Design a protein around this ligand. Structure first.
Ligand SMILES: OC[C@H]1O[C@@H](O[C@H]2[C@H](O)[C@@H](O)[C@H](O[C@@H]3[C@@H](O)[C@@H](O)O[C@H](CO)[C@H]3O)O[C@@H]2CO)[C@H](O)[C@@H](O)[C@@H]1O
Ligand SMILES: [Ca+2]
Length: 259
């Protein structure tokens, strides 16, 4: 644990709900709120990931019964022009180009995708990617790898602090049946620090050292929100279980609060 936290977190009294997807409207996700990422479908995604991210394909991404569903399936989508030879299909939505925020309280109420192989993530990257990943800054509000399906990881990545050179600032907790019941995964982002939590408890704290160094604190610029279920890489440490497909993360809501 490299960024330990141990404090309550709650939507601050002086914050307003400024953006939300309650996923009230069945069908396609709202195009004013999400776009699909197909950027590396043909090439293969990073982290040696095994999924194809299917755009506009209800089998992988749909709003149903108040939830965003992101669903992994074992299938080869060979009719897709950007098909990259993948054994699996999944979904990746982001608010890139639609919505971002500089500081704020983010609350995502979600049931995760389980099964050896599955790697559900709720995270943020900076709107200004001029510095690239990992320099731009990225916030992992929730990662789980389903070989360890009760363990919730909360992580930040910057130039100084990132997985590529094993200096990432993160922590972990556990949650009851995270693929069978809903938890709130939460980020409290101020100019001074980040808390990352489950259910109103921060297990993760990263402070702005206030040195004005982009390397250690790139978090004074807007960030957009990302929802996906990756397959393989970190999620594939105890292999990929054919039997576990299909597997789905249900997102009840995304709610963003600001001063
Ligand atoms: O490898 C260099 C390329 O990185 C691309 O950035 C990726 C990065 O490679 C990848 O490892 C990273 O993965 C993320 C996880 O490690 C963790 O942060 O949680 C995220 C949710 O699981 C997960 O996807 O993502 C980076 C951004 O996609 C650069 O985009 C590319 O320009 C560069 O050459
Ligand atoms: Ca809902």
């Amino acid at each position: 644990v490299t960024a330990p936290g141990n404090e309550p977190m709650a939507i601050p009294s002086d914050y307003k709900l400024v953006w939300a997807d309650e996923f009230n409207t069945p069908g396609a996700p709202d195009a004013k709120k999400w776009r699909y990422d197909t950027s590396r479908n043909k090439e293969g995604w990073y982290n040696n990931e095994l999924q194809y991210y299917a755009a506009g394909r209800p089998e992988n991404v749909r709003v149903e019964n108040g939830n965003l569903v992101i669903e992994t399936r074992k299938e080869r989508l060979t009719s897709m022009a950007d098909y990259g030879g993948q054994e699996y299909s999944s979904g990746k939505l982001f608010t890139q180009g639609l919505a971002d925020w500089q500081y704020g309280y983010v609350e995502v109420r979600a049931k995760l995708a389980c099964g050896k192989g599955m790697w559900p993530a709720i995270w943020m990257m900076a709107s200004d990617g001029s510095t690239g990943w990992p320099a731009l800054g990225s916030i992992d509000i929730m990662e789980m790898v389903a070989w360890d399906p009760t363990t919730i990881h909360g992580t930040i990545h910057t130039k100084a602090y990132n997985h590529v050179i094993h200096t990432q600032k993160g922590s972990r907790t556990t949650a009851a049946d995270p693929c069978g019941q809903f938890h709130t995964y939460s980020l409290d982002w101020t100019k001074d620090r980040m808390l990352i939590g489950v259910d109103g408890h921060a297990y993760m704290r990263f402070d702005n050292d206030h040195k004005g160094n982009h390397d250690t604190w790139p978090f004074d610029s807007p960030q957009y929100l990302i929802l996906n279920v990756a397959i393989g890489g970190w999620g594939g440490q105890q292999g990929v279980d054919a039997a576990a497909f299909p597997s789905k993360m249900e997102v009840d809501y995304v709610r963003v609060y600001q001063k």
